[PDB]
A paper describes a structure:
Independently of the football complexes, we also determined a 3.83 Å resolution C7 symmetry 3D reconstruction of the half-football complexes observed in this data set (EMD-9196). The same ADP-bound nucleotide state is found in the half-football (stage V). The differences between the ADP football and half-football are quite small (RMSD ~0.5 Å), and indicate that these structures are essentially the same, saving for the quaternary structure difference (football vs. half-football). However, all the nucleotide-binding sites in our football and half-football WT mHsp60–mHsp10 structures were occupied by ADP, indicating that under our specimen preparation conditions ATP hydrolysis had occurred rapidly. The structures of the ADP footballs and half-footballs provide potential evidence for a second level of structural dynamics along the reaction cycle, namely the inter-ring split of mHsp60–mHsp10 football complexes. Our SEC-MALS analysis and the cryo-EM structures of the ADP football and half-football complexes are consistent with these findings. We also provided structural details of half-football complexes, and experimental evidence suggesting that active single- and double-ring mHsp60 complexes coexist in the reaction cycle of the human mHsp60–mHsp10 chaperonin system.
The group I [name] chaperonin mHsp60 and its co-chaperonin mHsp10 assist the folding of [name]-imported proteins, and correct misfolded polypeptides resulting from [name] stress. Like GroEL, human mHsp60 can also assemble into stacked back-to-back double-heptameric rings capped by a dome-shaped heptameric mHsp10 (GroES in the case of E. coli) co-chaperonin lid to form ATP-driven nanocages for a substrate–protein to fold in confinement. Features shared by all three structures include mHsp60 protomers in an extended conformation along the molecular symmetry axis with clearly defined domains, namely an equatorial ATP-binding domain (residues 1–137, 411–526), an intermediate hinge domain (residues 138–191, 375–411), and an apical domain (residues 192–374).
Residue numbers in the entry:
A (entry chain T), C (entry chain U), D (entry chain O), E (entry chain S), G (entry chain R): 3 to 102
B (entry chain E): 177 to 352
F (entry chain D), H (entry chain G): 265 to 352
Write the structure that this text describes.
């Protein structure tokens, strides 16, 4: 379990951060902000200690910090650090890992 | 002409940008007079939409208090919560502010607020096309006028520094 | 657990892709797109690491990449890669395997 | 786990097939099709690999192919092979086995 | 498990206390009390004995007293001690730990 | 507390109106000397009241259908300023 | 597990009794009975045998008789002994213990 | 299939009445030569239709408000028996 600016998750959690908002299109048009939802590709900033729910010995969190992941849709806690909103998900909730 | 009220006729000149709407909260009453709020060189806030959240109203008051100048709030309508913040900072220490709704009734109000902004010099808030969110306002993003006075049932803007060439172009637009 | 174009599922998931839309009939007629639902025969493109939920040692995913499977009706979540929408199902949700 | 025309269930499933529709009565009358429900006596056509949910080693499916069984009522997946609709149930769902 | 002024939680619980109400803003404005919700950054005042729900031996509570934590939103019991309202949460419910 | 030991108290509603009622309660407070409660702008929660936060008057008489306050010690200069306000 | 006047709980239960009703205030006023809810500080009068739900051997009840505890709110069975109403809670339901 | 490859097809509703429309459809079927579908007494599901199960006519013309069928090969003895039925 690795921490952040005086923050650390608990036993299952993964604090991460979405990428940018993607205002303009690829080619030549630009999109407003009320559209485009919330960017579901994110990067992991801090990681919980590990799954203590594992019998006896606890279970380490798999997705390591610095990874690009495919966020879920609904599950997640909006937390603020230095007025920078990050999202805390649960380890079982991460969809994909952008491995490369 | 309107139906007179005295024995004789009267020629009155409504000068400045004045309109039938009065100050909402009777706590801004700094005039010691018949329900007036008088500010000199105050800033302006111009929202096409209402002002509900405290987060929305807060940065404007922050900028005003930093500059230490009175502030007018011309918008659709003021939340009771932001109103509570206003009355809080007004009854005690007394951040010079004032709240008034939108003069125009309907589609007319959009043009009226646009003209008010361009007259005072600034930018309307609550837009659709650019939408100018209140969270990120700037000291050159406020309406600035020489003097403002508010009654319970009308208020007046005076000396809006609004890029006289720009207001000229606006005038040419509406005249064509 | 095998990956794709900078993507990898997590612990249970199986990213797959439906087959074509089946526009025309077999014999001589052609069908529109608003009909014909979503083709439930698909191929697996990437596979998760494995079921860590297994006690102690984790459980490997069974259906291997390159297989034609009988998709479940509602299982899995839509995902996009390179503007190519793939469907990420759960390992227990795959109905049949087109073995041949 | 035995398969069918390029098909195989997964870990719990039993693909089977109802018997005929029973149009006429026994003695001398004939029944329409909108009546008579769905014939609940069926034969097993293909069988899953086995219950992997068994701890460690997986659990084999009991009902072997070629058996006449008493179908359940609601649970089941209508699958098509060669435009021949078969029904995929779960191993725990089969009610009875017509042993003889 | 450590106690407080004649109080001690039971087996999972963590009695803690929110921080101040944050009346004024950072720069120059002050906020009322009906706003600003309930301050979600808290400090732990007392800790339960430990998770007896663990098989055989019981499980000790992790977050130790004197820590700044990121509270959850809804779960929690408002208890009073000396007319000082503290909040009793469950060990699995704490979001983050302000480690520094 | 009234039937037995008899904490000397009495309950009466406000005059009953909108804005005029609020102004009248304000004037009553400033006349007796004290502070209105239930405010919007400062809101003066009842949980924390103080012995100088109460209205104080020499004598009070209540009928079933009216009541009278007599000697509100309300900062005669302050009530004077209030009078000047309402007269302007 | 210890008993009471011909009564004994079963396997999880804790029979306890609220304290007084707290009619008058601290300083100089007295409160009615329809107010003031139900006094949530209680003392344990009898204790169950122990949690048989523990695997193999059963689990002894922790809170011993004669303790002042912080009652929960809703869960609890109003039982009568000698026309003295006591409340039977569950061992996991007790909030705090007034240790001193 | 019409705007593209150009299957020759046309869609027209029933005459539009109550039992009379059902009788007219029966007569149309026996006139052209074929079997009415959607029956109650004998189901005649559309899934299993047959090349001798279709209505066949020499020529058909459709307006925006009426249509005409011509040369229905419907077992002239059979249509004769139908005529005898309805005339009795």
């Amino acid at each position: 379990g690795q921490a952040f600016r005086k923050f650390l998750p608990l036993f299952d959690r993964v604090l991460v951060e979405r990428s940018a908002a993607e205002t303009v299109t690829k080619g030549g048009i630009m999109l407003p902000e009320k559209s485009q939802g919330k960017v579901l590709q994110a990067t992991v900033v801090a990681v919980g200690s590990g799954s203590k729910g594992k019998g006896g010995e606890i279970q380490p969190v798999s997705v390591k910090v610095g990874d690009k992941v495919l966020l879920p849709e609904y599950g997640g806690t909006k937390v603020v650090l230095d007025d920078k909103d990050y999202f805390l998900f649960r380890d079982g909730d991460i969809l994909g890992k952008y491995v490369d | 002409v309107k139906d007179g009220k005295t024995l004789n006729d009267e020629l009155e000149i409504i000068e400045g940008m004045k309109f039938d709407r009065g100050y909402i909260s009777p706590y801004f009453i700094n005039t010691s007079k018949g329900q007036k709020c008088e500010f000199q060189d105050a800033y302006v806030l111009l929202s096409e939409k209402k002002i509900s959240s405290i987060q929305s109203i807060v940065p404007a008051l922050e900028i005003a208090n930093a500059h230490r100048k009175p502030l007018v709030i011309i918008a659709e309508d003021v939340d009771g919560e932001a109103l509570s913040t206003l009355v809080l900072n007004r009854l005690k220490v007394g951040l010079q502010v004032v709240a008034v709704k939108a003069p125009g009734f309907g589609d007319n109000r959009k043009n009226q607020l646009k003209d008010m902004a361009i007259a005072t010099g600034g930018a309307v808030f609550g837009e659709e096309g650019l939408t100018l969110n209140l969270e990120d306002v700037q000291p050159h993003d406020l309406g600035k006028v020489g003097e403002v006075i508010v009654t319970k049932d009308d208020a007046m803007l005076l000396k809006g520094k609004g890029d006289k060439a720009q207001i000229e172009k606006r005038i040419q637009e509406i005249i064509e």
